[PDB]
Amino acid sequence: KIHPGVAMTVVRTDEILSENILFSSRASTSMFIGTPNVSRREARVDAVTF
């Protein structure tokens, strides 16, 4: 336990799970929404999937 003639600096990164807030003003972003589309995958004997 003798000190050599050179000192050190240590560096280590740590990770946090954090819970945030988000403010957004009124009427800030504008959206344009379309009508959706259907399409049927071919017939499976017991069920049909759209």
Q: Which residues bind its own copies (CB under 8 A)?
A: 37, 39-40, 42-43, 45
> Which residues sit directly before a break in the chain (C to N > 2.5 Å)?
none
∠ CA 39-42-43, nearest 5°, is 120
- Closest to its own copies by CB, 31 vs 43, is 43
Q: Are 10 and 2 in contact (CB under 8 A)?
A: no
Smallest distance, Å, CB 32 to its own copies?
Answer: 15
Smallest distance, Å, CB 30 to its own copies?
Answer: 21
- Closest to its own copies by CB, 7 vs 43, is 43
